[PDB]
Design a protein around this ligand. Structure first.
Ligand SMILES: CN1C(=O)CCc2cc3cc(c21)OCCOC[C@H]1CNCCN1c1ncc(Cl)c(n1)N3
Ligand SMILES: CN1C(=O)CCc2cc3cc(c21)OCCOC[C@H]1CNCCN1c1ncc(Cl)c(n1)N3
Ligand SMILES: [Cl-]
Ligand SMILES: [Cl-]
Lengths: 123, 123
């Protein structure tokens, strides 16, 4: 393990990917959540969600430009998790815990799911 | 700053992007370095290199699938930096410092450049 470790590099990369998303640069998919639409990078969604990973790894589904989620999926809960994917920061509150946990479970985000379980234990 | 911070999330994302690159999943550019070719994600290259950021932010150059570097650019030095971009780990040695520093300077990777300067000061 002779290589030099840059402790800030991963966070710097994520910050710049979020800036790319903010500027709509090289976004290649739209996630439709009821009346709300969210543009993103498939590479990012696959890197953070078991649901999106299982969809785009399949060469048949790889080129999809639009994804539609379950109508019982809360748009604000998806937005909080889309923000998490791009920032490492989760907006967890007692007023949104159940919607956020239901959305993370659906999206197969094991660590968010684990944190939601810890939040409840601490609530 | 009420949001929960996931200290491992950024590194997890980068690890999965490197796995995507390893599996040639959603790669969209080839960087030609003399007789060597390297496939990657433009979003990743832009997030790590001033050179690649300046190229793909320009809507005229955004859709380029092939980039050719200066013939004096060392393929092993580019490979070490491409690995760095995707891992946060830099393979710096006295036997490759000058080639790696010349390549980072060319690619406009200020932090790699800074570390190379610190390595020399410590060498
Ligand atoms: C379930 N799941 C979560 O709960 C958290 C987030 C997450 C991210 C991904 C996939 C996930 C999940 O579910 C599929 C199972 O994991 C496969 C993993 C492990 N074996 C090596 C390859 N893997 C991989 N390689 C590339 C990507 Cl981009 C990736 N996983 N993405
Ligand atoms: C020179 N340079 C380096 O030396 C290190 C790596 C690096 C990464 C990028 C661009 C770089 C560099 O050079 C252009 C100047 O920086 C622009 C920055 C700062 N103002 C906010 C927006 N910025 C930004 N936003 C998105 C991306 Cl994807 C990005 N930068 N990439
Ligand atoms: Cl997660
Ligand atoms: Cl850098």
């Amino acid at each position: 393990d002779s290589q030099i470790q840059f402790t800030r590099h991963a966070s710097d990369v994520l910050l710049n990917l979020n800036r790319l998303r903010s500027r709509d640069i090289l976004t290649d998919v739209v996630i439709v959540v009821s009346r709300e639409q969210f543009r993103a990078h498939k590479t990012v969604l696959m890197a953070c969600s078991g649901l999106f990973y299982s969809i785009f790894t399949d060469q048949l589904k790889r080129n999809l430009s639009v994804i539609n989620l379950d109508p019982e999926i809360n748009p604000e809960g998806f937005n909080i998790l889309l923000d998490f994917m791009y920032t490492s920061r989760l907006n967890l509150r007692e007023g949104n815990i159940m919607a956020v946990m239901a959305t993370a479970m659906y999206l197969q985000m094991e660590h968010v799911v684990d944190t939601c379980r810890k939040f409840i234990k601490a609530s």
